[PDB]
Design a protein around this ligand. Structure first.
Ligand SMILES: CC(C)[C@@H](NC(=O)CC(C)(C)O)C(=O)N1CC[C@](O)(c2ccc(Cl)cc2)C(C)(C)C1
Length: 260
């Protein structure tokens, strides 16, 4: 069985999840809309849909470029989504006692490392693998011959396949958040025992709640998924810095987290 402090751990995570993750995106408003290395971007093409309160529907089909400049038509908006996401992610971290109790300099450092990952983890819960779309309340972002060649895309598909519970998602969010090996983490021992206790909790939760043979090695699959995601996080920083080189798009908060 799952021990007392393990039940205690999950419950504080599930709580911070519900307090800070607006699953319907009700409060995403005031966002901008569309008025050489770029295989980076073209693999990530999406169409956008806004359902009005009243029943109206607005749709955006992006331009298939051969030229150069129209690939950016959607970055202002994406930069607005990301800011709104990162704010929820920060609120999530600060509502966790394990996190509050680290030194401030460590708070900042853990966040700057995992913000993207926690965010991609949340988007996975609103992803629909049948239709290749992220359903964000009134927004939908729909992927423009099955190409899991883009690591980020293969990540969402593979992870959705595992059909995790909300508790498994929030714990994954914890392991990723409390990673001992992120630039400028002073308290590497604490953050390391903390991560291990989250991992152990995940391991037990699975042993206890998923007894069926399809859920063999799930804990290990999840753990590999998280390793994959760290790799994708680093590749994405490099892509993003390249976009900044040629055009500033990053909101203040994105500059704060990506280190500029
Ligand atoms: C997973 C990927 C297809 C995409 N997601 C979406 O388009 C849908 C949604 C916004 C819901 O995540 C996404 O967030 N990535 C990472 C973030 C991204 O690299 C990016 C985001 C904001 C800026 Cl300013 C630049 C780049 C991207 C180009 C929008 C692609």
């Amino acid at each position: 069985g799952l021990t007392e402090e393990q039940r205690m751990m999950i419950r504080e995570l599930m709580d911070a999840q519900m307090k800070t993750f607006d699953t319907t995106f009700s409060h995403f408003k005031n966002f901008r809309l569309p008025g050489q290395v770029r295989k980076d971007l073209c693999s990530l093409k999406v169409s956008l849909q806004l359902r009005g309160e009243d029943g109206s529907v607005w749709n955006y089909k992006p331009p298939a470029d051969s030229g150069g400049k129209e690939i950016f038509s959607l970055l202002p908006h994406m930069a607005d989504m990301s800011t709104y996401m990162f704010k929820g992610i920060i609120s999530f971290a600060k509502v966790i006692s394990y996190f509050r109790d680290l030194p401030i300099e460590d708070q900042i450092s853990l966040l700057k490392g995992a913000a993207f990952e926690l965010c991609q983890l949340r988007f996975n819960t609103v992803f629909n693998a049948e239709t290749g779309t992220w359903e964000c309340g009134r927004l939908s972002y729909c992927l423009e011959q099955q190409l899991l060649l883009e690591p980020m895309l293969k990540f969402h598909y593979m992870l959705k396949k595992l059909q995790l519970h909300e508790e498994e998602y929030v714990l994954m969010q914890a392991i990723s958040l409390f990673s001992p090996d992120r630039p400028g983490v002073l308290q590497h021992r604490v953050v390391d025992q903390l991560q291990e206790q989250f991992a152990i909790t995940l391991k037990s939760y699975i042993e206890c709640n998923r007894p069926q043979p399809a859920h063999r090695f799930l804990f290990l699959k999840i753990m590999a998924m998280l390793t994959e995601l760290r790799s994708i996080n680093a590749q994405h920083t490099q892509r993003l810095l390249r976009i900044q080189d040629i055009h500033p798009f990053a909101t203040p908060l994105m500059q704060e987290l990506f280190g500029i």
